[PDB]
């Protein structure tokens, strides 16, 4: 128009982030008082608001620092706030608000506000008509402008309103987008939950696991669905049961005293207690400070064991007594274990090893004993006679290989003696009867790995109930042979046969110390410490989880080892696939797969909390607006709001408002009260309460102050103060039926129809050339010479069953001469069309005016549909009609013979 900013020059505000300026700057400027000062230019977005700017710094000297917020307020003297919702339902008619703010101190502004037409939305502004209201805004005030729409395509869409003032150079535009969403409701289904554990049913051929996809047959079209998948880890990882509590070893800290033998009986429980505690890391529960003090006693046992060491490097009860081999093999055994604890001399230990080898070894491999120890109980089971060439050669043997690493380079005859005593236990192992002698002899061949075959079998078979090596007599022997056997299979890696032994000794609850409890204590704690250091087969659990989904090409492996603070792995796919998952290792897991989507639903809960009926009837100039509402609870609702918008160019009656305003549980602010008849398109009626038993009805007169041709349906919305969401919004228009804007829809596809019912025109200026040019551009798809056989009336959409009398031009509908095609039109176009039965018409339209499929196609008379009355035969002889019969007849043969130019 005149003295206004045109529509194409105006830039709508589009940039409305909720956060921006996610930037990184470096303070490298010359510092003043250790303070550097940086200047940055930034282009502020399109939002009309206040930004809060938060800066965090990091300096290798001053560390981190969070700065105080800095607010920047961005404004303009005149502007618009287009207040959309987060999302809206597709095909659902809704109202959107656009508030025009005028913050000029004392200068009113005559403004024009226009909504732009968007094919995705069916509103009043179209292709062919603008929708502009002219309204006045007083100084320091706002003016609300309501628009009603219906979203035509799901997905994101875009509303954009523009506004300009008269006589001034002020213009503003807001371009906001909103998500249009499908009706369905969220459903979550479980696809597969299987337990991942190789060995138990998941065969040694490691478990393979097939997972089908989800049903999703009731998935509403065009929606993504995500498949999440989880691998829940198992916490269960008992070593055996529990290591023995340190509080149970308090008696094992003994002051070593006496001669060559008893002092070893006193150094035994102490060395083996700390060794076990260092390995079970129970030093805490026990008392950390107590370690230093037990190490001093181990050093005291060793110093005092130096005084009974004879020149031949051997040991005996006294210095004048002949040296005992077993004793010296015990000295070697214990000192080989208290190497990591105290500072053990190599000359002494290796000297006693050399002595044992050169003096105390027979050619044939068996140690011989010359001078039995005085303390015979300290020997353990070796005392019970029978095959002591084995019990002994296995004892001195175990002492020698445990002294291997320390005296290999100092003693060169050691590998040969070791092998020597091993070939002999090897030849005579099958002739052993006692459980003890075979448990030490097998632990003695276990270390060289020379325990195989039949000897192996006899060793395993030896044990009763697969958990113990017991012999008639004292139990201490049986616990000692059991501990040798436990060490024997820990060397064997035999992690299956271990679980039951461990349970047996813990069950025995032997905590060492007692009469002749030297071996029992050294073996039960070397065995339960190696049970805790070797840990057999983890004892914990190891699971590889390889998953294959035909979507990705890559293979995904998930290692869920124990002692890792997670025990959880989850992966997700945007596509519902059939994927198979191979797992592997020890351990019991689980695999649960969940897909998510929206299924078909009918819904329509809303109004969930409120009923509403709004009827608009004519007055006895003005119309009557009655509102009727009701609560859907068990109680009467509290303070509710009645939000009303008016139909365009209409204002409520002041006196009727005054009459509602006075008490009766109803209220209206002085504000809505002193608005003049002008410019009052919005209104709020406050309700002290609403009933739940019956309808609460009110009603007031509305007057038309401003006359316009395309008027916008009014809208009423109820809702309790505490809840916005649980609301109801009905629309109201005197004629418009249902309060629904005209639109033709099938299933979920609909198209707006608020436009001219057809190409508006009079047969006089429409010449032949204007017919050959308009009926041959590309868009035009079909053009027929038709005749109206039947007209079908309804409440909303008319059906003009046109019988094709000639196919002038053919549009994708492969229609032959004689067949019928239904033409549909809104009721508001019955008056503009005046189609009559038995008459002929020249019609043509686009391909977008198709409705349906091929075996039942219907035509829709849109704004590009050319509807023209073909005069009958006895009307063309008439001279005033001639120009039209002759133009239609020339258009018939100019399109039938030649057609289009191309």
């Amino acid at each position: 128009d005149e003295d206004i900013i045109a529509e194409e020059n105006i830039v709508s505000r589009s940039e409305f982030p909720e956060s921006w300026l996610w930037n990184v700057e470096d303070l490298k400027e010359p510092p003043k008082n250790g303070i550097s000062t940086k200047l940055m230019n930034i282009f502020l977005k399109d939002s009309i608001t206040t930004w809060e700017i938060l800066a965090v710094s990091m300096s290798d000297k001053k560390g981190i620092c969070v700065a105080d917020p800095f607010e920047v307020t961005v404004m303009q003297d005149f502007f618009i706030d287009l207040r959309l919702p987060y999302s809206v339902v597709r095909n659902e008619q809704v109202e959107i608000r656009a508030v025009l703010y005028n913050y000029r101190q004392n200068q009113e502004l005559k403004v024009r506000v226009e909504l732009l037409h968007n094919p995705a939305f069916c509103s009043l502004a179209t292709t062919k008509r603008r929708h502009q209201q002219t309204v006045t805004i007083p100084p320091k005030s706002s003016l609300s402008v309501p628009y009603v729409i219906v979203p035509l395509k799901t997905g994101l869409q875009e509303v954009e309103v523009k506004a300009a003032v008269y006589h001034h150079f002020i213009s503003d535009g807001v371009r906001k987008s909103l998500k249009v969403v499908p009706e369905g409701i969220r459903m979550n289904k479980t696809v597969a939950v299987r337990t991942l554990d190789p060995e138990r049913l998941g065969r040694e051929g490691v478990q393979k696991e097939d997972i089908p996809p989800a049903d999703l047959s009731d998935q509403v079209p065009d929606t993504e669905s995500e498949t999440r998948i989880l691998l829940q880890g198992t916490p269960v990882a008992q070593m055996t049961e529990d290591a023995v509590d340190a509080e149970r070893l308090k008696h094992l800290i003994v002051t070593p005293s006496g001669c060559g033998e008893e002092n070893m009986i006193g150094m035994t429980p102490t060395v083996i207690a700390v060794h076990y505690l260092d390995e079970t890391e129970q030093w805490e529960k026990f008392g950390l400070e107590k370690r230093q003090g037990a190490l001093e006693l181990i050093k005291k046992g060793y110093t005092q064991q130096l005084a009974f060491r004879q020149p031949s490097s051997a040991f005996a009860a006294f210095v004048k007594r002949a040296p005992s081999t077993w004793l010296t093999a015990y000295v070697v055994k214990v000192f080989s274990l208290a190497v990591n604890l105290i500072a053990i001399d190599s000359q002494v230990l290796c000297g006693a090893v050399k002595w044992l080898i050169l003096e105390k070894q027979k050619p044939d491999g068996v140690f011989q004993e010359d001078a039995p120890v005085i303390h015979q109980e300290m020997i353990g089971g070796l005392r019970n006679n029978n095959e002591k060439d084995m019990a002994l050669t296995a004892f001195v043997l175990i002492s020698l290989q445990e002294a291997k690493d320390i005296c290999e380079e100092q003693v060169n005859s050691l590998p040969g003696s070791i092998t020597k005593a091993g070939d002999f236990l090897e030849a005579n192992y099958m002739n052993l009867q006692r459980s003890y002698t075979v448990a030490i002899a097998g632990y003695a061949l276990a270390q060289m790995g020379r325990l195989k075959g039949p000897l192996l079998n006899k060793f395993l078979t030896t044990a009763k109930d697969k958990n113990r090596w017991e012999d008639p007599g004292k139990q201490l022997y049986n616990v000692e042979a059991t501990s040798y056997a436990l060490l024997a299979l820990l060397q064997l890696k035999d992690f299956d046969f271990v679980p039951p032994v461990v349970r047996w000794l813990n069950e025995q609850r032997y905590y060492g110390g007692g009469y002749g409890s030297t071996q029992a204590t050294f073996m039960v704690f070397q065995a339960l410490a190696q049970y805790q250091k070797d840990a057999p087969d983890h004892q914990e659990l190891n699971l590889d989880v390889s998953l294959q989904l035909p979507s990705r090409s890559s293979k995904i492996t998930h290692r869920i080892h124990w002692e890792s603070a997670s025990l959880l792995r989850s992966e997700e796919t945007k596509e519902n696939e059939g994927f198979t998952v191979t797992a592997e290792g020890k351990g019991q897991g689980t695999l649960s797969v969940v897909t998510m989507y929206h299924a078909k639903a009918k819904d329509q809960l809303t109004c969930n909390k409120f009923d509403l009926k709004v009827t608009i009837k004519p007055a006895p100039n003005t119309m009557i607006l009655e509102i009727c509402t009701r609560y859907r609870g068990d109680q009467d609702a509290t303070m509710s709001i009645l939000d009303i918008s008016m139909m365009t160019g209409f204002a409520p009656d002041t006196d009727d408002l005054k009459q509602l305003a006075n008490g009766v549980d109803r209220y209206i602010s002085k504000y809505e009260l002193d608005k003049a008849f002008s410019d009052r398109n919005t209104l709020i009626i406050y309700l002290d309460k609403v009933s739940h038993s019956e309808d609460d009805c009110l009603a007031f007169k509305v007057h038309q102050y401003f006359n316009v041709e395309l008027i916008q349906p009014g809208a009423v919305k109820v809702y309790a103060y505490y809840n916005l969401e649980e609301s109801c919004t009905r629309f109201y228009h005197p004629e418009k039926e249902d309060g629904k804007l005209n639109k033709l829809c099938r299933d979920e596809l609909c198209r707006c129809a608020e436009e001219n019912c057809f190409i508006q025109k009079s047969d006089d200026k429409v010449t032949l050339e204007e017919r050959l040019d308009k009926a041959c551009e590309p868009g035009v798809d079909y053009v027929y010479k038709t005749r109206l056989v039947k007209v079908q009336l309804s409440n909303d959409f008319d059906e003009y069953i046109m019988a094709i009398e000639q196919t002038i031009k053919s549009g994708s509908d492969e229609v032959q001469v004689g067949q019928q095609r239904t033409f549909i039109s809104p009721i508001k176009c019955r008056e503009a069309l005046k189609l009559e039965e038995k008459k002929h018409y020249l019609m043509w339209g686009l391909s977008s005016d198709f409705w349906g499929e091929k075996p039942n196609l219907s035509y829709i008379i849109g704004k590009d549909t050319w509807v023209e009355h073909w005069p009958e035969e006895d009307e063309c002889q008439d001279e005033e009609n001639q120009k039209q019969c002759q133009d239609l007849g020339a258009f018939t043969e100019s399109m039938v013979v030649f057609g289009c130019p191309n």
Binding site: W20, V24, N41, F43, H538, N542, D544, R552, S554, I556, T557, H558, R559, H561, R569
Partner: protein, 189 residues
């Protein structure tokens, strides 16, 4: 009479004063902004001829034309040395871990009836590192499709093997080229 109106960088005379030479005293000449400058409503585009044979002194009638806001570059930056007015220049850069694809600079040039940036806004593409090495007797604890700047890869040897080296390695970026911090570990049997 006064000499021809002096050349102005912003506005050029209108018709038909541009071809005149007879400037009797008390004459007004009208200018129209050049490309690219815009008229300043509050200011008169006319000039007048003085007694000592001079013209009315005036500051330049058309102000300099502005370019459209350069915009924002997802994980990149726009260096604006000196404004976005007609004849201005801007440069582009990407944030570490991202590579530049397109023009490294843009110019505010005159197009048709207005000024427009010479080149389109380029793109910063995530610089991916090459796929992590597969080690013998070990695997990569829960791998990944793509490893970017700073993404790390954790390793794990199989049962019966010992790990000797860095438990994991990370992706470093040098000259838009992704390279591993270092060699992966080894699982000695």
């Amino acid at each position: 009479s006064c000499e021809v109106p002096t050349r102005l960088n912003s506005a050029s005379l209108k018709q038909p004063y541009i071809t005149q030479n007879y400037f009797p005293v008390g004459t007004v000449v009208e200018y129209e902004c050049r490309p690219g400058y815009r008229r300043e409503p509050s200011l008169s585009p006319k000039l007048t001829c003085l007694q000592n044979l001079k013209w009315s002194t005036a500051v330049e009638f058309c102000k300099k034309k502005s370019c459209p806001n350069p915009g924002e570059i997802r994980n990149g930056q726009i260096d604006v040395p000196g404004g976005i007015l007609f004849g201005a220049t801007i440069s582009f850069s990407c944030n570490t871990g991202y590579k530049l694809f397109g023009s490294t600079s843009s110019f505010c040039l005159i197009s048709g009836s207005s000024v427009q940036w010479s080149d389109p806004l380029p793109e910063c593409r995530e610089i991916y590192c090459p796929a992590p090495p597969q080690i013998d007797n070990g695997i990569i604890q829960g791998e990944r499709d793509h490893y970017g700047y700073r993404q790390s890869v954790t390793y794990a040897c199989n049962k019966g093997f010992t790990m000797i080296g860095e438990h994991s390695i990370y992706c470093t970026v040098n000259n838009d080229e992704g390279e591993w911090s270092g060699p992966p570990p080894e699982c000695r049997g």
